[model samples]
Target chain A: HMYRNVPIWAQKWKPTIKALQSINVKDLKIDPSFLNIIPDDDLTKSVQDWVYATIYSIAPELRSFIELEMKFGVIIDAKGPDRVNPPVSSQCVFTELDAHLTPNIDASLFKELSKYIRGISEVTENTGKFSIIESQTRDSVYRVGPRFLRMSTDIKTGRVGQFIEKRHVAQLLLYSPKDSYDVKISLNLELPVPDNDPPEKYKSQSPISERTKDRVSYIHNDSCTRIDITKVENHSETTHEVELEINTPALLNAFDNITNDSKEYASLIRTFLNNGTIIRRKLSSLSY
Target chain B: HMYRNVPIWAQKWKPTIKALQSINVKDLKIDPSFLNIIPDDDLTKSVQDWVYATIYSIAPELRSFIELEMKFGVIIDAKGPDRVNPPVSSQCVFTELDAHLTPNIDASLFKELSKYIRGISEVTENTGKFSIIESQTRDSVYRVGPRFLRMSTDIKTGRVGQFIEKRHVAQLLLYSPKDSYDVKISLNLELPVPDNDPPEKYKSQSPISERTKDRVSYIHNDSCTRIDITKVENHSETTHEVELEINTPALLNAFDNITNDSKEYASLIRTFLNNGTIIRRKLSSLSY
Candidate 1:
């Protein structure tokens, strides 16, 4: 069963609903065991929900510009002395099931990634499912084009405003890839807590609490990708290793749909990741 | 016969009048020939007029204080050119005539004298009846006593106001005296001209002129006093020659009744003295 009735579904599906069916899950090398854990109907709905959620979470304006097909690939590298081998690298790729599928990306993605990546060594404390691998350099890449066709409607008048509007955008990946070696890496995606009530001390400070509350709709998830390349023989020779680290605070005001208080939602996600029971209950209760 | 129809009885009976029965005119002696030239009636009338005028010219309050009975004497001592001599001084002596027949002198007398004295240097191109006399140190002495009384009568109320009820003043002469000396001291007086009139171009260049129009009243008179002293061998030294200098402007104004606008009358007197004709008639015929 898929959590179609939950607030997450409504918040996530608005952007990529038309493009979900065109995403080729098999091409991305998604673990078959992970797929088998749910029935076909439920899995398809869940995947579609995730696709929409991820796309809408970053930039809601992307709905008219492009549609997400699938994640092409995600490469993770592990390094450092804790691993058995020197280092290890892995990759996963997805394909477009429909020729019309595309993905929209944010232009400031790299600048945002640079902040977390550059400061990775300092992110030692992990409050959620995320195991932060400190001291990893991260960078992001995006693939664009293959516009989505849509009929534009006036939001106030509820009438067709434009016909056959082709959306243009790119799909962005946050990662750092390694070659000729195996590297150990960790990936975590956490929902941000919806902050309906700001701390009392900051209430009088601008931007006002209500404005901060409105921003909760945009920060759906905080995805962190970390890798250690210290064990690689040629690692020391590299100019600067990059890491792709993401957090919700920077992305909180990026969309218009999701309306949960980001701080609370993020906290809930953190609680679930810590216990896992809450996440299982939430996931099991989904209907397809 | 009195030359101005002055009555002989009126002249003789006038207490203020002092007839000059005889005056030492030649060789320092009262000449009998000069006495014979005067007709009895005219002589008496002239004396009466002189006395009346002199008394009237003096302020009423000063009449009693300045004795006219005391005979004033002068003495001169010959000294080497390099030796500085003692100064000659004269004091007015009160008499019975001055005590009983006092008259109210004009306050305008000093005012007019002041104006004339301040401008004397400029009036005649510095060469009028009053020689420059080395500028006479530009010293002015002014005093108001019972001898100078001013009274004002209100025509509507018939109320008489004594502005200066009683005052007496004496002009002190302080200067070194010589056996025979003649010095023409000029009095320079100035009055403020109406602002509506154009400024004098020559005077306008002076810094003080821009601030005020100092129209000058110039009066010149010879202050000639001759005193001769004879030192008797082995005996007492005695005064042999003496002459008192008369105030020319005071004498003219005393006789002329010059008003503010008729200050031109005084100027006419200067012209008369210079040209040997009565200029006062010419001024009286001219329109303002």
Candidate 2:
């Protein structure tokens, strides 16, 4: 339905309806209940079944892309499928989602992606299940299973619960026709506090104590395909509270290099704003 | 009779009375009439008379010792006179008769007598006179009279008339009796002419001229009585007709000393005055 009227070749593939349906969750060493449900008929087709099955397993909030290879038939090619140089057509899709179980496409989608890519691991969904695959010839691939996922127990406590698959996640992968990509991934979570206060006291006092109770927390998760061609998969997670003093001369210089919409990147904009405050404070101290 | 009782034993009689008396004025080339008058008498008597007469003629003003010697019959011994020893009783009458002419002394009788004395010639008298006596000793006696005497006509002008013999004038000769004394008299005269009335234009600018006249005239006389012991007699004269400007400081000092009755003698005073003026003038010029 998401690709209605598009060519069957351009449609997102389903993993459950694929010819490889005999490859069960046990073979992948994952619990069967953790897999998404799909129609039984859809599990018999090869390409459509693979697309449908993969989308269900990952959750629709996550993004997916396709790679196709024909073993025998070749209607478009004059030669047999084995001798055909080009395979069937393939396409990629990017999903937009919040950290919660919600689906939306908005400008914030890329910002979330950028944050997830930057690898802050304090977010419950990104905490433990992340894994990377490394190969010699392609970018590494990162994946997350139900075993690595976690959830927040309560907003006030900021504690993590047992591992669970996160539906609202993003995945991006670049794949080859026949070989698997080695992957690497990092996740990061940043809780940011407002830095507006008397400048004189801010530098002298600890930012932890100065932080407000209800500060905005950012959760990030990332999956990368073909991160390295030959290495084993690697995964990393880090979490920090974005300090009020996020702005620094180094960050501002980075901002200066970005000619695109500076305001759209909230972290960068906030960093630059704090950097301007720091510059103002420095100039004020220099006055008589 | 003049020498009747005088012992010839005490007298040395070598020259005859005529031989002594015959010493004539022509032979001396001096007038004989001015000589002291004596009575014709014996050799010893005439010799005694000659001695008394010669001393009287030479210095008639010296009546102090002459009167004493004649009145007391104190002969001037060839060696020296002794006031304590009187001549013998027989010589007493001669001594008495010699005193008769004392009161009859006339200074005018010796006028023009300076020429007849030794070292004297061509006697003349102008404002004063002089007297002379010839002696057998080839010496002559002369006396300066109270008035000035001159032989040359040119000497009449500006000649200091005479010396105003001071009371101590005789003391000069008494201290050292000698044969003669030189006499110099000088005068200083100044004449001022009046400015011309209705003076000529050129003559008005001409330097006015005044006249200063000075005269120094001298005469020398001699004596046989050993009375001309003084070196010279200086005389000074001024008419006091014009106001005298004693411009010379030396002269002024001398005049001042003279007027003040200072003990400095004339010659020393004159020298001091002269030198003082020279030194004072030099100092004045230097001061200017």
Candidate 3:
């Protein structure tokens, strides 16, 4: 229940955040290191659910991204969702960031909700059902506040099966009182596998300069929301890297109105988590 | 001159930074609210050029933005050149944040540059000169370290006859030691206007959602820069509102690689500033 004010920097939790932000499928068994770790025990129900919501979102986002790419063909320097350039920002605080691709998307999930059932469709829960491969969740570790800058540094991370043998993800969502909106950031990690695109293709400069630019913006009373994507990479094997980030100065605020953990918040959180289907459906029936 | 360690939050700057960053034009004379400011008294020389460079920049940038709009159209939500979303954060410090729009653009220099040379260009001398129009500069009041962040907080102000009856602008360039290319953030201010695009059209949400989707990214020895224009209506004629913020990895080492007041730094700052012209030229010749 991130009702706290006085935002702490993510740096405060360095040790805990780094240790469990990856996968552990060594022998088809969960990593032994995670044996002692519990899920959401130290985290908030809100953070926990938000993390899962973010993780579960990749499917539809990927579909939307790929569909755009297929139609326009790859934008040589375009940097948007799931594109070559992984949009990432250092200064922006993200409350939820889920990156990393699943093995393959469940085709049925893209259909209308009325036309399918999770268990009955080809896209069963197991299709994307993550194995407790390895995980970590730290709750109430950071703060944000009085009126303009509300933030929480609680970090959520884990590894799951189905993505390139084993895939990993980590995320955060930060809210600011001054702005009335929050930011979500996360990353999907992978070994530099062989691919036609050169590593340079993912550098921040690429999309920021050419391929990607600004879109449209909507401002509601007291709030505003803007969305964009960028490519982030680890500077040197150990230096810097990137994940996924979402900015909603207003829309995301529509989910939480000052942390009462309002029913509205919960309802939208689920809606946010489940929107993967909506995004897919929105695009499934369309053509570029 | 700034050899410091231990990066502090930008919040620390509230006391010293927020106080001295703006200017006003009434009738024919520039209001004297900016008497205390200098060009770059206690700051890095490169930062100085970067600041001045940014001002001299108004002409070319306006040309580019307008030229594009002349052909294709004005991005209703297009506030990238300057506004509240603060397209600022530069090697140059931001003494002011004039986020409103000006009435018209000055065209004197651009027309003559066509007949001039570089060091010999008509755009060369007067291009960078003018009466001390409401200017101020303060240096060394802030600090940055290790790697993740770098910043300039100095400010200068003025208005020209050709632009918007009288136009204004302000900027800052924050740097992070980690990435090879740095980012410059600045605010270009002007008058308020309307369009076919509903006020909703230019709302922050749209561009962030669209023009900003990511695409191809590339590593750069130079640097990658992003621009933004925001509508900042002074909340209380004083109190402030915010958009989003980004800062990262406390572990990031800060500063150096270039000498303070060094020629390379100055050269690059100039390069960085001059790129505005290049950006215009490239787009100037474009049909789309």
Candidate 4:
């Protein structure tokens, strides 16, 4: 029926991402550098998934200004891969008020971005200090967001808080007739699991994950799309080797509508991921 | 007889952090707002402690890219608090390479900060991602960095990993020998506690921390310091506030060094933080 743990909704749009991956250079009638515009499907999936989950978790107060609108730093052809290494790679942390940016976006655009986006801000009554960020390319940009993490403590033995855990996020680049071809959406942020290590640590205090055992692979759904999802349980590592290839008519649809018409692109993504497996919406949304 | 629960060596600097709280503005015949520079000893102690553990847990490759040297953003004046309300408050995440800093500092500075500081690149080759940051004031800038957080998973039942415990940091915002002081050595970090959530989500998770119901008080050591530490242990929210104030000439003849002989500036901060009430050393160095 619909009783499995990962549910259809959890993986609904996977095929779209997988299908998007299959569009080879020969498949694209005349496009050569078009592949440069495609983010490594597996790599992009995880990144967008985390970004989505992060924005989702922001406190409601800070959540007001955000909407799924306006994207930046990832434009293709404008500064695509042919350049070899990016001219610049840097990171900066901004507060709700004072900000600093890199690969510098339009001043007013950035100002407007501070609202719908996380890192850019319009000043509020905040008194605390800092949250950190370490990005790789100016080809990337995300504004305003959350910690993507949560913590709880154990009350026994005065052991204070006991251990930690992580959440699951997935992203996929899909094929669509809307505009360009593929749009990415990350969903099914299944709840986090607690670290069962006694109040002490992992594997009997023998070192936690360093991301050494991460696995990134492609999924073969045979539907209308090709999907590839990567599962990384390690927090100690950075971006891993990903399979990169992009074809299809790719979409540059209105990102501004992700919220109001939540299902338009989201459902498309979900359909690609579903691959006709699992129960349905009611059970899926109850993922935790 | 030395078998108390949480090892003192594990929490060596806890008391020292607690001790820095006794600085008084009234004693100096000053009034509030100035207290803004003063960190709530207990609050900051835990912050830095967590930060220390976070970085300490980072892998060696990451550790190597970082150092006890580097700085950015938060410069004095230029646009500090005196302006009343900063026009904006934003936070951006920068990689060690593609950084967006205000008034821009050297790139290498951010490179070395990945481990010990808040913004920089990772040596571990992360392909793509985003960590989060949300600040409300641009008036805040911390140089001698503290570690950011980390996450991991158990990978077994899809049951993510859980966190095991706490940390302690110190913010000794001394009075104006000429308005606030320096001494930034937050490097030798303390280690971490693993996570242990049961993979199930929790809004009704029991009283995990004794901090929910806390008492702000003071500690008295025979040493020449009257210690008052504030305690609030709620991990679910940011601004787990802190009150900092420093008075004992606060700076022990060192301020002139951070610029010419930075080691001197650093060591002083290291000393003031080394108040010897706990067993101390070794365990703390594992911090980022």
Candidate 5:
């Protein structure tokens, strides 16, 4: 359907993207980099389970987008060898061929994600300004300067917003599939619990709760397919990691053909294809 | 009151910010550049009226934050000579000492502002992720890599989102007072009217309505205190422009004192202070 005001050429890929179906566990593949992080047999199984559980947890959210017959790509990223404890956290990005589907996807996506990420008592949305630069020289698009963040407020006390509960977002569109450059979707899996301190001027608020602290981790724009994971528990040593993407052979063929349509496009496509080679190559090596 | 988790030093300025009140036209001074843009006496009064009307329309929203005793700053930015008709458009940004107050201010601020800017039928919020870097050297905070945009969706048809209705945000914090850098709140004054197209695959959509197109303009991070003004009328060449900021003698004293507390802070303060010097110096030179 006409979800976006895409360039005329995009219509050719409609049947290809629509014919693609949903993903299953067998369709999933582990990147060698991730496997390298968790070499243990038991941990490997555990990581697989974590991936299965989390993706299954968010299945309905992804399904909502697919139901629209919208062309999109998903990258499920897992990270962390728990600093002390062993619970591995994960996050994902959904890049759509258009921006129109973002808010709805986010509306459901954030809701579902909050359910899976532990210790999220409340889910608040923050707003900010952004600008972008699409350089033909670089295969990936980038976010240029003139960006600032605003904090979400609590209405109950009618107080000004605070920066105590901080969340970081990754600009992971860098390594995403070349075709889905129009919009990239990703979010912080962690949500902060409200402050316990009373509303008063000049008061030094209490420290962030350990419960929320454990869920805190730095998320930068380093990976379009992966997010930094925090250690959920306080003490122990174990590692769990996984990688995921929504794809089909038909989709891949279409992507390749679209890239070949233009040298610059193909060059940019290589940047993403090669970027995911560690994982994509491994995924292909296995007969699923 | 405790709006954000500001450093311990911020407490020293609470009373200063609290005692400060709202702004008035007497306190509003046109930047030299803005004055230069509209040399005609008639156009100046019209621009003043435009600024007054727009700000007054959104005044209650700012008051909501002020009522919270939140220390913040506001910059009402006006731009453009109506291309065909002689109506000028404007936008503003609210910078808070903390993030905690942002969402609430936005909740009301957006509502109030929407009422002022013409042609907004429905107000829908879009969610996206952001990351920042505080360059101590430049005395400016910036949004670095890994940024992407998402489209807001329409629910009735249960279709995915589209890119037809796009809005730009300015990263105007660069020239803002250094003290209120915690949460910079700004939004697109323009809202898009939904398309008449039915939810269907492979159908070309219609062009954007001129009613909404007139409100269209490019907003970047170039000015923290200004936004691009689109010529709202077709075929007219009259210019209307203005610049605004929230301040008080007491607040200025507090801002000045806060800068001297540290050399680095003082230098950054100069960046903002000097940045606003053109208008500020003009404002100060006036008896009011």
Candidate 6:
């Protein structure tokens, strides 16, 4: 049901966007220069221009980032009738980045960027497939029309029992080193698990395991969506981690149901829930 | 140093190519049409034309394929001064191909094709880097300027001890389904290990283990370069595997050196060499 051009971000953040439109001199702590303005002059017009410029300059990047994230969330979450329940997941750590890097992205801009990553493609139901391979590999940073560079791959398999599909969205960040500025970013979005089957019959569960240098796994239960962002070494490798939950109460109910099932289940839940568990991970020495 | 415009294939296959040129009527039994020709008539000119046409129709495709393989071998084997030892390996299996699909490839054609896969690129020493990210992802099949299509990704990591690099080459086959005829191909090339360090000092050895659905590991003792393609399933998934050895005696010497080191080494070699060991592997139920 997700359309191509819907402003999902604006809809989700309607209140904040509407609040952004409302502001006056009474809401601001003016600079000393504001007091110097003469009462006789057209101070009202000048004040309006100042507020407009200030909001215009600062708001776009944040707004653009919000829209870009929402767009990705929607695209990643959309599923077909026969979708495999476990979330299609991705994770990476930005090994390097500099200060000047900032977000300047929107849905239209993202669509344009996707044109290259997806190639000359076709859409059927929710599937976007492309057949025309390009004649040369291009630099993601300098020569691309879009500001950000991205690459991706997909893994689909289904001979065992149920059909499973996973997409590996590769490094999507600035690649130009000559501009005297660049951004190193690794963002992983583990979309909400699809629910084509009832919870009682949901055999298509995901495996919860420690993340490793060679693999990243997701904890799949029809519960809360998780998003995490923190500073890591040199600090840490990953800087951003984001998630979204579909059902809040159901996740709470999950604990109760497990407790009712068996004493072992209750102990299992009590084990990790109260104790501190360290998630292990490592980095590869491979280049993109 | 590998130059940009060298005919590496021609030089390597000179003997074979020359032998093809020398094929004559004496080497072939005449078809029914040959008996229809009159001895009194000037048949030499007509015979020459027939021979020329026949060779022209068939030689190019095989010759083109040979050149393509040689070109890839050279480019992949080439390394920089700060080269990391151990082969940068790639492997895959074709899930589906039809017969009308024939090879028509050459170095120039491959160079043209690489333009798309590599993008707008630059080469420094043995390094080829690109800065331009294309605006759209294209299909590997239709709408491409080249007859065949290809795409690739690289994994480079290094932080713990030595720098390790590996390249993951994905499904490189026709993607055009509209055509009544098509070809499915999956190829994996494990290039010769780079010789940047002495055998005793080389700590950058690759892991040797059985291949799995989730992982593929190479046997790295700097002994034999391995290329394996076999009938996998429908009967077998893989259809092509190619290899080139640098030194035959060194591989034999590798077994001797290991035996001299310990009884455990001899037992390990004997266990696999004498007994038939099943290679454990499975296909992921994921799509490309």
Query: Tens digit of lDDT per residue, candidate 6, span B21-132?
Result: 1112232121101111111101111212222222233233221221101001111112343211221011111122221223222334333333422331233421322122
Over A161-252, each residue of candidate 1 has an lDDT whose tens digit, in order, gives 33332332233221111212111111223222133222332223432111000000111123211221121112122222222222323222
* TM-scores, one per candidate: 0.14, 0.11, 0.16, 0.17, 0.17, 0.16
lDDT of 1: 0.24
Q: Give the TM-score of candidate 4.
A: 0.17
Q: Write the per-residue lDDT of candidate 4 for residues B71-151, one digit (tens) a residue.
A: 112223334443122111111111122112221222333223223212211223322222223212111111113432222
The regions of model 6 sitting more than 4 angstroms off are A1-101, A106-288, B1-80, B84-288
The segments of candidate 4 whose C-alpha lies over 4 angstroms from its true place after superposition are A1-219, A222-260, A263-288, B1-54, B57-288
Task: Tell me which of candidates 2 and 4 scores higher on lDDT.
Answer: 4
Model 3 lDDT at residue B62: 41
RMSDs, each prediction? 53.9, 75.3, 28.1, 31.1, 30.3, 33.4
How large is the interface RMSD of each prediction? 72.5, 94.8, 24.5, 27.8, 28.6, 41.8
Estimate, for each residue in A94-153, the C-alpha lDDT of model 2 and write its tens digit: 111211111111223323432443353345655552333211211111122312222222
The superposed Cα distance between candidate 2 and the true structure at residue A42, in angstroms, equals 35
The CAPRI category of model 3 is: incorrect
Report, for candidate 3, the interface RMSD: 24.5
The local lDDT score (0 to 100) that residue A216 gets in candidate 6 is 19
Candidate 3 ranges beyond 4 A from true positions: A1-288, B1-288
In order of the candidates, what TM-score does chain B achieve? 0.21, 0.16, 0.24, 0.20, 0.19, 0.18
* Per-residue lDDT of candidate 5, residues A1-288 (tens digit): 212222333333322111111113132122111011211111112222222222223323232222001112233233332111111111112222321222112223323332432222122321111112111110111111432222323334444344232233222222122122112322222222245332332233332222211122211111211212222221233222122222222222323343233222222222222223323222222312
**DockQ-based class of model 1:** incorrect
- For residues B1-288, what per-residue lDDT tens digits would candidate 3 score against the true structure? 122322222112111111111122112111111111111111233343333333333443242121100011111113456322322121112223332323111122223222222222133333432111121221111111221111111233321111111122443433211112223333333322223232232222212111111111111122221111122222112111111111111101111223332332333333333333232322333322
Residue B256 local lDDT, model 5: 35
Against the unseen true structure, what C-alpha lDDT does each candidate score?
0.24, 0.22, 0.23, 0.24, 0.23, 0.21
